[PDB]
Amino acid sequence: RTIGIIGAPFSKGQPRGGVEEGPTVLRKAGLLEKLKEQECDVKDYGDLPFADIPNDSPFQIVKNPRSVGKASEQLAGKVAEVKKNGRISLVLGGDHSLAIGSISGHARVHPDLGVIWVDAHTDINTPLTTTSGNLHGQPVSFLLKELKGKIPDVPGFSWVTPCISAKDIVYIGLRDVDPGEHYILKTLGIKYFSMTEVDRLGIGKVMEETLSYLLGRKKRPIHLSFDVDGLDPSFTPATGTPVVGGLTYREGLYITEEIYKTGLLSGLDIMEVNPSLGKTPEEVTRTVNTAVAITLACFGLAREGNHKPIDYL
Amino acid sequence: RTIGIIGAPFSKGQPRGGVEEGPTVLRKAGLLEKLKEQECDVKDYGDLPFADIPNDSPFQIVKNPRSVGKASEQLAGKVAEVKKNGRISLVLGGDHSLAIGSISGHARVHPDLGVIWVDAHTDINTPLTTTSGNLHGQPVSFLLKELKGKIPDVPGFSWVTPCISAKDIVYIGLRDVDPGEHYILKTLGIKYFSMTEVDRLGIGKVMEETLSYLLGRKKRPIHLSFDVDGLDPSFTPATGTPVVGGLTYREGLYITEEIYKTGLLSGLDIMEVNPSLGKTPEEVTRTVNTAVAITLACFGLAREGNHKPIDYL
Amino acid sequence: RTIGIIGAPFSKGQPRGGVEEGPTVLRKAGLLEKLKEQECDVKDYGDLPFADIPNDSPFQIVKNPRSVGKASEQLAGKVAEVKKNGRISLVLGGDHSLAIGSISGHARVHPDLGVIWVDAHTDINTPLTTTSGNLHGQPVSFLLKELKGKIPDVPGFSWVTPCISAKDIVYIGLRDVDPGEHYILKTLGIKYFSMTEVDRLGIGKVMEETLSYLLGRKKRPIHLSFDVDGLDPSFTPATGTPVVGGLTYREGLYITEEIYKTGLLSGLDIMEVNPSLGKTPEEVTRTVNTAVAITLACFGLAREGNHKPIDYL
Ligand SMILES: N[C@@H](CCCC[N+](=O)[O-])C(=O)O
Ligand SMILES: N[C@@H](CCCC[N+](=O)[O-])C(=O)O
Ligand SMILES: N[C@@H](CCCC[N+](=O)[O-])C(=O)O
Ligand SMILES: [Mn+2]
Ligand SMILES: [Mn+2]
Ligand SMILES: [Mn+2]
Ligand SMILES: [Mn+2]
Ligand SMILES: [Mn+2]
Ligand SMILES: [Mn+2]
């Protein structure tokens, strides 16, 4: 397909620093070249320069609010620009707090978008329910219209305007959800397939139900926010918040191959890859290699094989 | 839920000695504290003191019959006492021979109980079909009423009285069954889901069929005897009789989450954890960590998340 | 069952040399003894002596054509001889190019045979579509009647005569298919279950559909060509062309147990085991151990257990 690459070297949504190198190690893995090797029209919009915000004391428990809020604001603008150029935005990011800007900018051009959130976490804590204070665990709360009223005026996010409803999002891969987050899940009736649902139904039925749920009424642009920790740490160990018993490499590729086949992928986020957290150089390459594989599947690379519209014999 | 913890530091049902440290490493992993962290009312009935039986020569091929028989007799009494206190018995054990006492004592208070046996083995050898002579591979034969007549008078087990019928037990995870055991399986018509059935149907259908099979006619108390070697050794390596191709971490949690949701868990055994068999300190923690996780799922810990009956917003 | 073992220490269908030791390490693993331990009548037809062909320059891009062609010709004759003796041929091989001779000889005695190809690759490149020039990636093209006309006269294969039609073969495990191969797949309407189909349907449904597809109309002899790289490299690392995200140990045993139960297994190939490629001695034993396990399942070894037709009690 036609892609718009945008690097988001940002880490202030969480504690560990190596995540801001995500764009770097992914590009170094040959991601752009691999994409072009497929039927892909690629345009690199570069790495966003996230100016340093020295004065950024916590808002209550919430850490680096101004830095996070600004980074998302800048990203929102870049994503909308790539979308206005008629390209699928591909955000190579640092931490998941960037989802606020990615989905926000995406929704500016396509308000009817539907979101698929692949993650071990729901990232739906509010600045008031969070216990860690890390903003990468709160992006969804800022985007949901139903939660508008339970979100205090956190410095750096006055530009935010909830752009999705509880029913325009589906979670896949959940296995470490905070109490307050679970309360929000059940209270708002959010659609989710935790690892339990995946075990019960199988990834095939999960995807069928996911896509039917979001595209049932009518077709709409899809936004895939992919947290690499959604996959089991045996595949993506170099990440800040790993949780055992995750989605397999295969399921990861299944999810993305199915999303690709819809022809509706509109926005994509490959988040939380932290090269500095690899216990070994191999754990780093294993994580980056899996992240690239998942990305390539989102744009057409199929396990059964691919061939050009010609007569090979 | 409401739990009654009882440690069973016993190993004479098999050759390797480290298994008697199971209660110790599990408690040290913070199992009691983790349980209390959930909606659990926990009461530790302590570790059973299994007096030394110096004179215990083999009965034919059967090893340490008096020691094994006595340990189960003592455990049977403790389990019945915890059951009479209105608590779910949680036996942190050594080897699986202890199942004879656990199920026996449990059945004294709840004769209508149904058993789910998660294991790589059927543990249904009789003292006459066993080839190893290890009693942890024969517990089920002593408990089945239909096999009463094929069980010689083994020193130490005169107190035993078969308490379950062939149709009150379901096996999950089988992958190393002895010939005589398979003969008993097919002859008595015992319900089982070997790894082959799990591969064929998926763990979801397996659990649906398991619970429908045991609770179809009417609801009854459930006894879960969980041998950690039922799970693949990539998850629980520190165990005496590991067999490759086992149940995954995920399936292990699925089985237990589903049992929990029935609200009928009445007795639980977490067996065969042998810290001394870990090739590395990490293999030990990996095994103990998985054992704790499985235990927590049996008492409510759900992957989709948990929340108190309050308004979190 | 009744087996006819034939060693095929051959490697010239690909670059890496250790694969010709496959027969050796498998026999050393006790394969013959293990088979006899089951209800198996085993006869070792020995290791085929593949005479050295010093003058064998490439045919265009195609490497070692005369050596490969001769090795398959010799193997075809041996397989037909074992089949005429009323035995299931078990080819312990080197590289997969040997499939040309195995299926060829098998089809001489049983022209109505159906093939199940477990592999990460389709091995259907023609001498003209191949980009590697390695013949182990082209065996199927030489056997398919529909491709007769697109196969140049390659030195060493004048003895070949396509013996199977597009609809007498089913692929399972595909995850690295070349463009030209995919073109052939879709153009000839070949039945396949890539890793994507396995993820979608589950290995149970895959096997049901595979066997129904090949045995629907009427029962016929089955030929299983098993490339060990079909299974994930976490199980069979010592192989020349490994690809991540493969079939699990369990699925491997499921496939073969189901094939065994048909009672129609007529020919079997255990290919691509290369002891020299093991990064460690354990990776070598892990690969050989998995290969033996898969082989034993093909001849009756069931995970639920096995028992002789006698009264064990
Ligand atoms: N629920 C935890 C973990 C969040 C991880 C963030 N992520 O999934 O990108 C928190 O609120 O800090
Ligand atoms: N079937 C073997 C292995 C038993 C292992 C015991 N277990 O599963 O707890 C025997 O009878 O010795
Ligand atoms: N498709 C590649 C890989 C073939 C591997 C051969 N195999 O699967 O036995 C080629 O044509 O060289
Ligand atoms: Mn996460
Ligand atoms: Mn996340
Ligand atoms: Mn066991
Ligand atoms: Mn056991
Ligand atoms: Mn292959
Ligand atoms: Mn092959």
* Distances in whole angstroms, Cα of residue B199 to Cα of each of A198, B231, C289, C299: 15, 14, 20, 19
User: Half-sphere exposure of B46 toward its Cβ, with a 13 Å CA cutoff?
Assistant: 4
CA end-to-end span of chain A, whole Å? 26
**Angle, in degrees to the nearest 10, between helices B195-215 and C195-215:** 90
Check C185 against A305: CB less than 8 A apart: yes
Nearest by CB to residue B308, choosing from A174, A179, A195, is A179
Report residue B230 as tokens: 């039922």
Q: How far is CA A122 from the centre of its chain?
A: 11
A222 Cβ neighbours under 8 A, 6+ residues apart = A113, A114, A115, A116, A214, A259, A262, A264, A265, A266, A267
Half-sphere exposure of A192 (CA within 13 A, CB side): 29
CB atoms closer than 10 angstroms to residue A48: 21
The structure tokens listed for C90 are 């078990």
Structure token digits, residue C107: 């089809």
Taking an 8 Å cut-off on Cβ atoms, the answer to whether A303 and C175 are in contact is: yes
- Which candidate from B179, B201, B244 shows the least CB-CB separation from C204? B201
Q: Is B244 helix (H, G, I), strand (E, B) or coil?
A: coil
The overall longest dimension of chain C from CA atoms, in Å, is 67
Specify binding-site residues of B for Mn(2+): 96, 119, 121, 123, 227, 229
Please give the domain boundaries of chain B with CATH numbers for all domains.
1-313 (3.40.800.10)
**Residue reference for tokens 């098993």:** C226
How far is Cα A207 from Cα A202, in angstroms, rounded to an integer? 9
Gap between the Cα atoms of C254 and C248, Å rounded? 10
Spatial CA neighbour of B276 closest among B5, B14, B7, B4: B14
Chain C's closest residue to A207, CA to CA, is C200
- Letter string b/e over residues B195-230, b meaning 16 or more CB atoms within 10 A of that residue's CB: bbbbbbbbbbbbbebbbebbeeeeebbbbbbbbbbb
CA of residue A130 to ligand 1 center, whole Å: 9
By the 8 A CB rule, do A70 and A47 touch? no
What gap in Å lies between CA B259 and CA B236, rounded to an integer? 21
Which ligand 2 atom is nearest residue B178's CA?
1
Question: Cα separation of B194 and B180, whole Å?
Answer: 16
Burial class (CB in 10 A: 0-12, 13-18, 19+), C210: buried
β-strands C114-118, C222-227: how paired?
parallel
| Distance between CA atoms of residues B287 and A162, nearest Å | 44
Q: Which residues of C form the catalytic set?
A: 96, 119, 121, 123, 136, 227, 229, 272
Q: Which residue of C has its CA nearest to B194?
A: C304
Q: How far apart are CA A95 and CA B137, in angstroms?
A: 50
Query: Cβ atoms within 10 A of the Cβ of A63, count?
Result: 20
Pairing, β A169-174 against β A114-118: parallel
Facing residue for A304 by CB, picked from C177, C183, C184? C177
| Tokens 């995920």 sit on residue | B250
Query: What is the C-alpha to C-alpha distance for residues B161 and B100, in angstroms, rounded to an integer?
Result: 10
Q: Which of A21, A95, A110, A121 does the annotation list as catalytic?
A: A121
Catalytic residue flag (residue B96): yes
Structural tokens at position B22: 């199971």
The chain C residues in contact with chain A (CB within 8 A) are: 122, 126, 129, 150, 174-175, 177-187, 192, 194-202, 244-245
Ligand 5 centroid distance, CA of A137 (Å) = 6
How close does chain B come to C306, measured CA to CA in Å?
A: 5
Bridge partner list, B267? B89, B223
Question: What are the start-end ranges of the H helices in chain A?
Answer: 22-28, 31-36, 65-84, 99-109, 139-143, 179-188, 195-215, 249-262, 281-298
| Residues ≥6 apart with Cβ < 8 Å to B242 | B120, B229, B233, B236
**CA proximity to B49, closest of B78, B28, B84:** B78
| Phi, psi for residue A50 in degrees, rounded to 5 | -90, 95
DSSP string, A106-145: HHHH-TT-EEEEE-SS-----TTT-SS--GGG-HHHHHBG
For a pocket test of ligand 2, which of B10, B136, B177, B247 has the largest count of ligand atoms closer than 8 A to its C-beta? B136
Residue A311 Cα, gap to closest chain C Cα (Å): 8
**Beta carbons of C279 and B169 less than 8 angstroms apart:** no
Which residue CA neighbors atom 5 of ligand 1 most closely? A137
CA distances from B41 to B1, B37, B45, B299, B306 (A): 6, 10, 13, 10, 17
Hey, whose CA ends up nearest to atom 10 of ligand 3? C137
Asked if C305's CB is within 8 angstroms of B184's CB, the reply is: no
> Which residue type is seen at B169?
I
A114-118 sheet: strands from edge to edge: A41-47, A2-8, A88-93, A265-271, A222-227, A114-118, A169-174, A191-194
Length, in residues, of chain C: 313
Angstrom distance (rounded) from CA A187 to CA C282: 52
Residue among B303, B307, B308 minimizing CB distance to A195: B303
- Helix A195-215 / helix C195-215 crossing angle, nearest 10 deg: 90
Whole-number Cα distances in Å, A232 to A221, A227, B228, C196: 28, 11, 21, 18
Spatial neighbors of B285 by CB under 8 A, at least 6 apart, are none
- Which residue matches tokens 């080819």? C91
Residues of C in contact with B179 (CB under 8 A): 305-308, 312
Long-range own/partner contacts, residues B185-188 (CB < 8 A, 24 or more apart): B185/B122, B185/B124, B185/C304, B185/C305, B186/C307, B187/C313, B188/B144, B188/B146, B188/B147
Please, where are the H alpha helices in A152-275?
179-188, 195-215, 249-262
The residue nearest atom 10 of ligand 2, judged by CA position, is: B137
Are C277 and C239 in contact, with CB atoms under 8 Å apart? yes
Three-state DSSP class for B92? strand
Annotated active-site residue A123? The verdict is: yes
Ligand number nearest CA of A19 is 1
Q: Tokens at residue A115, please?
A: 């979101």
Closest CA to A128 of A178, A70, A55: A178
Helix (H, G, I), strand (E, B) or coil at C98: helix
Q: Could you tell me if A95 and A271 are in contact, meaning their C-beta atoms sit under 8 angstroms apart?
A: yes
Distance, CA of C51 to CA of C71 (rounded, Å): 8
Cα–Cα distance, A152 to C179 (Å, whole number): 54
CA distances in angstroms from B39 to A180, B261, B300, listed in the order given:
16, 14, 8
What is the rounded CA–CA span in Å between residue A110 and residue A103? 10
CA-to-CA dists, residue B177 to B77, B99, B206, C35, angstroms = 30, 18, 19, 17
Q: What angle do CA A199, B175, B68 make, to 5 degrees?
A: 110
Nearest CA in chain B to C234: B234
Tell me: is residue A122 an annotated ligand-binding position.
yes
Rounded Cα distance, C283 and B37, in Å:
42
C-alpha to C-alpha distance for B28 and A105, rounded to whole angstroms: 49
Q: Chain B interface residues facing chain C, Cβ-Cβ under 8 Å? A: 122, 126, 129, 150, 174-175, 177-187, 192, 194-202, 244-245
**Cα–Cα distance for residue pair C265/C301, rounded to 1 Å:** 14
**C-alpha of residue A94 to centroid of ligand 1, in Å:** 13
Contact A194, A170 (CB under 8 A): no
Ligand nearest to the CA of B13: 2
Pocket test of ligand 3: the residue of C11, C100, C132 to mutate, having most ligand atoms within 8 Å of its CB, is C132
Ligand 3: does its nearest atom lie under 6 Å from the Cβ of C123? yes
Per-residue DSSP letter, C189: T
- Technique that determined the structure: X-ray
DSSP tag of A164: B
Q: Which three-class secondary structure state does DSSP give residue B157?
A: coil
Q: Residue B16 Cα, ligand 3 centroid: separation in angstroms?
A: 46
Listing DSSP states for B269-312 in one string gives EEE---GGG-SSHHHHHHHHHHHHHHHHHHTT--TT----SS--
State the amino acid at position C294 in one-letter form.
I
Catalytic-labelled residue, pool B21, B96, B110, B232: B96
Residue type, A266: S
